[PDB]
């Protein structure tokens, strides 16, 4: 899963992430590909649908 610039940094995906791959960065939250279990729960928990 990969996050996009559409992210407004609401922090919902970060915590919801089972594997905790998602971390806050310089301009938006980011997804670590190596530890992402491809569940897609972050996409579900997003008011703007940034995680793709």
């Amino acid at each position: 899963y990969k996050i996009t610039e559409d992210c407004v940094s609401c922090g919902s995906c970060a915590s919801e992430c089972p594997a905790d791959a998602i971390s806050q960065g310089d301009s938006q939250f980011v997804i670590d590909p190596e530890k992402c279990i491809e569940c897609g729960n972050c996409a579900n928990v997003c008011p703007v649908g940034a995680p793709v």
């Binding site: 609401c10 922090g11 919902s12 915590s15 919801e16 579900n44 928990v45 008011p47």
Partner: protein
């Protein structure tokens, strides 16, 4: 998935709303999806433009402090205090309007004095002379004293005589003794400003101090002045739920909180010209129905039918039969403005305090209340010609209810079980006797709103039924009272259907339902009054009594202020919806543990109604064992 309501009429209208392609509060709640965790825990702050700041709801992990250095406890406590201040402001503005109306009463005017004995007793409570005086001079002096309670900067405020001396002394020692209402709201708003108060205990104490000006001054004065001007409620029959709407009559629904407008609309509905106009537009007559607290007021004083509580307001329009929807202030979903576009309904705002975009604004003129109400009602009546009867669906579901149980009415009912050779009459002594003997285990107040987070009316009904089954007499206000009315608990027959043995015996002896509707949200002051009298009769503080308050499905800031002042008065309060405080461990500990050391009561957070009933019974029993009864 989860059911939206336990009420069948609500479910039928939700199916109709789905068929009509209109959105409801349930649909918007679904669209909101997973709500923000930071805001839900109360660890988000936006009090200055250095922010927004969010700190971790879990201590020891993540970001600990806001930019200014404020901890999670500070952010949570300030957010809670601002909720209390907002609720206090709403109630105090309602009471201030009532006092100003009292100040403008006259013998030949639209607003008169209808209960002179109540006014004389209130004048006694305000140190206003009455003997050999004109009634309206007394009314104006009482109104002046009440208004001074709101904004006096020197001296002490005036509190009702039912408040025990011990409770006042405890407040003074704790530092929460109330000042003028607007002054306390301003104090809370000042101390939550960036770089002011960063100590959770002091913040909670300031919020308690502010809430006291609501419970014992604002709501109390509003209730008593409303009784003076519009009559003290007495036991009266009415009908509840959406079935009260008439297909063949003009349907005028009064929504909101301020009672002067609804009183004037009720008076205008009997005007011969308006009745003739309703006949001429092709209707059988005028059918006034009330919703939420204004519906509670007009129903307590005149038996006006109650159409429904908070989360039913939209569904009232969904019937397609509401020709006019007249709203003043508070708990008026703005979505109504959009929703009324899909029907013929005139959505009429009347208060400069509550403008709603795309609604029809007809300012209610307090200088000429009756003429202004007649004009608004004439607009509603004339809209009946735009009714589309093919879109009308009114569920055949309505329920008989009995209400009007003011403290005076309760005392009058209790006089029935007083032996004349013993006495005394006109006291709360029979209630104190049944509580002390253990025939009644206690008294519980069920108050509050609906909330989409809870199956609508489910928690209210389950809590009330559990309490009365455990021989706890229940007094209800607001949307909880209206849920009880719709369900059928506000009936004498309910005593033998739901109550336990002791409460059933008490209901049979006193000839009352097991659930007593004491009025609107401001009428929660009546409950305080009642408890205070009982305490004053037993020579104890209100925290020594087996009493409790429950808010199973609360949503509003007013509910937060109510729970805060109920706990501060010494009455344990159960909340069926978690307030946004879980992010601050210190605030949770203060509200649920340390408050008992301060004021002898505390908050209980319990989302399971059956568990809440069990906890309430256990707490009442332990307070009884402390008291020796």
């Amino acid at each position: 998935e989860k059911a939206k309501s336990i009420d069948q009429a609500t479910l039928q209208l939700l199916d109709k709303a789905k068929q009509d392609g209109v959105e409801t509060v349930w649909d918007r709640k679904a669209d909101m999806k997973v709500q923000c965790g930071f805001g839900s825990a109360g660890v988000c702050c936006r009090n200055c433009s250095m922010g927004p700041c969010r700190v971790s709801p879990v201590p020891g992990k993540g970001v600990e402090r806001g930019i200014c250095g404020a901890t999670a406890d500070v952010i949570v406590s300030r957010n809670f205090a601002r909720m209390v201040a907002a609720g206090t402001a709403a109630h105090s503005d309602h009471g201030r309007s009532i006092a100003l109306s009292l100040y403008h009463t006259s013998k030949d005017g639209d607003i008169k004095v209808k209960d002179e004995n109540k006014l004389k007793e209130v004048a006694k409570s305000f140190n206003v002379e009455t003997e050999g005086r004109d009634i309206y001079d007394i009314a104006h002096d009482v109104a002046k004293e009440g208004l001074s309670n709101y904004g006096k900067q020197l001296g002490e405020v005036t509190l009702p005589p039912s408040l025990p001396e011990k409770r006042k002394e405890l407040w003074r020692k704790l530092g929460v003794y109330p000042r003028a209402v607007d002054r306390e709201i301003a104090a809370v708003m000042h101390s939550t400003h960036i770089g002011c108060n960063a100590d959770a205990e002091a913040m909670i104490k300031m919020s308690m101090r502010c809430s006291l000006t609501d419970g014992w001054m604002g709501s109390f004065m509003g209730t008593e002045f409303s009784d003076i001007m519009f009559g003290t409620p007495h036991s009266i029959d009415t009908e509840a739920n959406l079935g009260v709407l008439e297909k063949n009559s003009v349907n005028v629904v009064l929504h909101g909180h301020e009672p002067l407008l609804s009183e004037m609309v009720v008076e205008a509905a009997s005007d011969p010209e308006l009745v003739e106009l309703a006949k001429s537009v092709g209707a059988d007559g005028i059918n006034l129905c009330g919703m939420c607290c204004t519906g509670n007021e007009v129903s307590m004083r005149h038996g006006i039918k109650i159409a429904g509580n908070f989360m039913q307001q939209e569904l009232a329009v969904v019937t397609g039969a509401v020709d006019g929807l007249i709203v003043d202030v508070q708990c008026i979903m703005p979505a109504l403005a959009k929703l009324s576009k899909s029907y013929h309904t005139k959505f009429i705002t009347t208060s400069p305090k509550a403008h709603i975009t795309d609604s029809i604004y007809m300012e209610f003129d307090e200088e000429n209340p009756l003429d202004s109400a007649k004009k608004i009602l004439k607009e509603a009546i004339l809209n009946f010609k735009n009714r589309d009867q093919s879109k009308v669906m009114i569920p055949e579901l309505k329920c008989k209810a009995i209400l009007g149980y003011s403290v005076e009415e309760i005392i009058n009912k209790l006089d029935k079980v007083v032996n004349t050779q013993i006495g005394p009459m006109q006291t709360v002594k029979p209630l104190a006797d049944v509580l002390v003997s253990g025939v009644l285990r206690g008294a519980a107040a069920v108050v509050g709103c609906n909330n989409p987070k809870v199956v609508q009316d489910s928690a209210h009904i389950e809590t009330i039924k559990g309490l009365i089954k455990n021989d706890v007499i229940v007094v209800v206000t607001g949307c909880a009272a209206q849920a009880a009315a719709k369900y059928g608990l506000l009936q004498k027959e309910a005593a033998e259907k739901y109550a336990g043995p002791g409460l059933a015996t008490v209901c049979k002896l006193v000839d009352i339902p097991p659930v007593l509707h004491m009025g609107s949200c401001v009428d929660i002051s009546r409950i305080l009054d009642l408890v205070g009298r009982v305490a004053n009769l037993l020579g104890v503080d209100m925290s020594d009594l087996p009493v409790a308050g429950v808010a199973p499905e609360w949503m509003s800031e007013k509910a937060v202020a109510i729970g805060t002042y109920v706990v501060t008065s010494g009455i344990d309060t159960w909340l069926g919806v978690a307030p946004p405080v879980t992010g601050g461990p210190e605030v949770v500990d203060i509200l649920t543990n340390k408050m008992e050391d301060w004021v002898g009561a505390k908050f209980f957070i319990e989302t399971d109604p059956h568990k809440a009933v069990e906890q309430i019974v256990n707490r009442m029993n332990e307070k009884r064992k402390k008291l020796g009864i």
